[PDB]
Structure formats: structure tokens, C-alpha cells
């Protein structure tokens, strides 16, 4: 609420966001959830800032560094490309760098990862990344959505969560496939409520 926070949101624009769950496209459902999340964060505290990057496509792309201007955030999400596979480690490191350079250093630091596709990393690689976030005072929220048939994916995401978690400041939200709307499942969770 009165919390002051800079957040970087990492969007999954991989090839897995093209096929399957129609109405809406999985990328569009994701974009709408980010829209609502940025509205919640900017209304919670007018000094909060939110930035956006995409993890897949032709390579990790920073659409905006964190800003308090909802219009800049929403405009930057127009015309997203789809393809490839997520580069999770590079995305998290670029996101961490953007948060390190936040103008208001009094802001807490948080990364939100939308994980809607396979996690092609081993736990060991994910735990190094997680411990480094923790060392740098960065909290993590993970949204695990999409296909629910790869049983190592939640275990890999749980290992990343456990490496970063400090004072239960980090969270995972499992969105069961065949869901209502990505945003509806997220609304009552710590990703929105803090």
C-alpha cells in the first residue's frame, strides 16, 4: 500500500503464446493482466514505477525502463512480436540492471516473471540467479501459467523462488490451465495485493 516499489515485468512472448488457448490469445491475456497490474501498482503509490521487457521473440527487449506514467507503459506494449523461446536468465539480469539504475533509490525492487512456456534451465543455474537477486535486494513474483503437462517446470520455478526468497517477499502463483482469465486468477493473489 504505502510501499514504494520499482517493478520490472518480464513478458513471455515465446512461440508457445501463439497456438492453443484461443479467446483470447495467450499473449493478449498476458498483456491485459499486465495492463491491470500496472494500474494497480501506479494507483497504490504515485511514486511507484513499472517497466516492461519481453523475454523471447528475436531476443530480450526492454520496452520501457520503470516509469510512473501508465500511458508510457501501455503504449510500449503495442505491436509485440511472438516467437522463439524465453531467455529467462538474460531477462532476469537485464531486469535487475534496470532496477539497479532506478532514479529513486528509496524504492524497493521487484521482478515479475510470466512463465508460460518450458523452463529450459537446470535448478543449479536457476539457484545461482536466485541467490544473486537476493544479494541485490530484489524480490521475485512468478506467474506459472499455460500448459500443465511438464512436471519439472513447477519444480524448477519453485527452486528459483526458494533461492531468491527473503522474508517471504517473493511469490509464486500457479494459474491452472483452462482458466477464467489470467487477470482474474491474479487479482486476489500477492502479485496484485502485495
Amino acid at each position: 500500500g504505502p510501499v514504494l516499489e520499482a517493478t520490472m515485468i518480464c513478458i513471455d512472448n515465446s512461440e508457445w503464446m501463439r497456438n492453443g488457448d484461443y479467446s483470447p490469445s495467450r499473449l493478449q491475456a498476458q498483456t491485459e493482466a499486465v495492463n491491470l497490474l500496472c494500474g494497480a501498482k501506479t494507483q497504490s503509490n504515485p511514486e511507484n514505477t513499472v517497466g516492461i521487457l519481453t523475454m523471447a521473440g528475436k531476443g530480450v527487449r526492454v520496452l520501457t525502463t520503470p516509469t510512473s506514467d501508465l500511458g508510457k507503459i501501455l503504449a510500449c506494449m503495442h505491436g509485440l512480436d511472438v516467437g522463439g523461446e524465453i531467455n529467462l536468465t538474460a531477462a532476469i539480469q537485464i531486469a535487475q540492471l534496470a532496477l539497479k539504475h532506478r532514479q529513486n533509490k528509496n524504492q524497493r525492487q521487484r521482478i515479475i516473471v510470466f512463465a508460460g512456456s518450458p523452463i529450459k534451465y537446470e535448478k543449479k543455474a536457476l539457484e545461482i540467479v536466485g541467490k544473486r537477486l537476493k544479494k541485490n535486494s530484489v524480490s521475485l513474483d512468478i506467474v506459472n501459467f499455460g500448459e500443465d503437462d511438464d512436471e519439472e517446470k513447477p519444480q524448477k520455478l519453485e527452486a528459483l523462488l526458494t533461492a531468491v526468497n527473503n522474508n517471504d517477499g517473493s511469490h509464486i502463483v500457479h494459474v491452472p490451465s483452462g482458466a477464467n482469465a489470467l487477470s482474474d486468477v491474479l487479482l486476489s493473489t500477492p502479485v496484485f495485493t502485495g
Partner: protein, 105 residues
């Protein structure tokens, strides 16, 4: 200093927003206060009062859902301004949010 890929009218950013359904704004903490979702046809607001988006946009383009100006006050009348004309009456808004119906293709 606006970049070549940003659209501004003076201080006002033009912000195109695609929605799968206008109803997803019902829980949007920024925009929920300004929409009356019982209304038919795209509307714009004359100020930022509660449920202000009531003024009918003239001859609206296909898939236009609404226009929200985040600040200022302007002439608010029905069936007078087409979308392109609305861009000149920001009157101090920092953002013009233009909401569009998403099409799955």
C-alpha cells in the same frame, strides 16, 4: 523530447489500448471509476469525475470502444467530435487512452 515512434499532441501522449472485452476494465484500478458499462457505443469524458465517459463519439470507427482523457476539461457533447477531432481537445490531459476491441488473428 518525443521519439519518432511516439505520438504526442503537445504534452498529451496518444495511447492505443487493445482489449479482448471492454468488461476487463471493470476491475482496472485506474479506469473503473470512469466507465459506466451499461452504455452502448464508444464515449469520451469531459472531465475526470466519477463515471465521466458518457459523451457519444461521432461516426466512430470500427472496433473503437472508448476514449479516456486523464486530465483537463473539454467541451463534452454527443455526436459532435469524430475520433481524429478528439485529439485536439486534450486541454491539459497528459494521456489520451483510446480503447480498441481486440481481434484474434
Amino acid at each position: 523530447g518525443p521519439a519518432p515512434n511516439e505520438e504526442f499532441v503537445g504534452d498529451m501522449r496518444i495511447v492505443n489500448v487493445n482489449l479482448s472485452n471492454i468488461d476487463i476494465l471493470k476491475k482496472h484500478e485506474t479506469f473503473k471509476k470512469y466507465f459506466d458499462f451499461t452504455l452502448t457505443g464508444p464515449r469520451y469524458n469531459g472531465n475526470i469525475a466519477e463515471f465521466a465517459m458518457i459523451w457519444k463519439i461521432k461516426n466512430p470507427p470500427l472496433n473503437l470502444l472508448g476514449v479516456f482523457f486523464d486530465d483537463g476539461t473539454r467541451d463534452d457533447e454527443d455526436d459532435k467530435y469524430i475520433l481524429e477531432e478528439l485529439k485536439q481537445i486534450g486541454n491539459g490531459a497528459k494521456n489520451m487512452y483510446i480503447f480498441w476491441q481486440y481481434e484474434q488473428k
